[PDB]
Symmetry: C3
Subunit: 194 residues, 3 copies
């Protein structure tokens, strides 16, 4: 005495109502509908950069950070606005809880497309479950200030674990100018979203 | 009488059939299922690059543009093919309606993974609701022509509002070559997709 | 009826039909099944299974981790190249894909979900066109390094072509007496709709 419209279906052989879905796109997790490849973003809140410090120097920066998870890849993006003109190599460090992923350096939130914070443990940014990782490299960056070019240079990134916690360490190299730049890179997480 | 298979569920107490879903991945909007963090792309159509003028000069380029919404983040990508060799700095300006997000400089469309145009108003590219934004920086770029390296240089980006509309302004700097390059950067939108 | 439905399920008394209400710019129905309008699919080298590449006829190899991420109709290509041999000149790193199916012919790649599971999906979503043509090329700035030390600020070209029925992504890095060790990404468009 009732009908079902696709993607709902009714099996008369077992009197059961189902939702049909494409398994490469959607899935069931603990009985609830979910995506196979959700976009999760771990980020500094809007207008709420985190304070970063160049090692033990009295040199600081505001950083806006987004860590965008697609499939098992993380796209890491940072916008760094250093306060102090410097010559040399600055070391910027981001520390994350090695079990939960929680940023210990500064305030980060898992933020949906809605603009609302999501109740998601941020394990999805951790490179390995075993707390072992080799990943490092360099990206080209351009330092500027107030819309004026200052320098074409580079920034290293390195992913490590120390004392059980996950670290992303960035080293910018400057000559005379404030370390003010945006850079991104990608890395892989072995932590499945399930 | 009838049964439900997960992710459908039946509560015998209140005689109600529901769809169970993971709130960080899916949500309900106006009674309809939606994604918490949908991917939307606002782009120039395939084979319909946008013609851009270099400021008040009589010089032009064609550009393919994609603006990808990930969570609240926007990944802006442009591929610029300039016509004219130059030594100096070129200004490429994109204007968007400050309320709708619609590109006023030339044709852009919201394009689904299906390859069909979507009937979505592109507010999701706008940085703020109160028409305030500070975001600028520079990216390293390489100018080339027909597969040959020409110059390693840089391009600024700046996000502004003027007279109620949203602007992305790019400034490429060249020494003799045509401005032909690809660049990308990320910025944040305060406009929740709800 | 004797039952109720909670949104996003709805019941039309008029026709005695239970339906799912969904936002069509985000979700759709394909072959009677729920799907996404713009799903993320990633074609990639497997975890800890980098692809071995040779530079042309030279006795010069690199290991490459590759991800090709599909959103909407755009593909974000990312490669991490770890060259074994110091060199001066321009290296060619060539990736070939079946021009109809998209499968990587040069080495092992898999469509990988967010779950960490391989997905049973033909990788046609990386192909620029059904009609086996494409013009897309450019250069990206790169920085070569080794063991955390800066070596060189340089560049890498990319070019998308078809030859003899197959799709090629060809990268050429230019080095001056360092190992070609760098990461680069670029974006291109696919005209293959995911349906
Ligand atoms: Cl599918
Ligand atoms: Cl939530
Ligand atoms: Cl979840
Ligand atoms: Cl929508």
């Amino acid at each position: 005495s009732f009908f079902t419209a696709a993607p709902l279906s009714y099996n008369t052989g077992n009197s059961t109502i189902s939702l049909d879905y494409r398994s490469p796109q959607l899935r069931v997790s603990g009985g609830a509908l979910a995506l196979t490849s959700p976009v999760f973003v771990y980020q500094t809140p809007f207008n709420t950069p985190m304070r970063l410090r160049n090692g033990t120097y009295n040199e600081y920066a505001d950083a806006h950070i987004q860590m965008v998870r697609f499939g098992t890849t993380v796209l890491f993006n940072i916008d760094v606005t250093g306060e102090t003109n410097a010559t040399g190599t600055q070391t910027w460090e981001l520390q994350f809880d090695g079990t939960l992923g929680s940023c210990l350096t500064g305030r980060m939130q898992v933020m949906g497309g809605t603009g609302e914070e999501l109740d998601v443990t941020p394990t999805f940014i951790l490179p390995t479950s075993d707390k072992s990782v080799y990943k490092q490299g360099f990206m080209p960056i351009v330092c500027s200030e107030n819309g004026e070019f200052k320098q074409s240079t580079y920034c290293s990134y390195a992913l490590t674990y120390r004392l059980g916690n996950f670290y992303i360490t960035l080293k910018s190299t400057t000559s005379g100018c404030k370390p003010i730049f945006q850079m991104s890179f990608m890395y892989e997480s072995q932590i499945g979203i399930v």
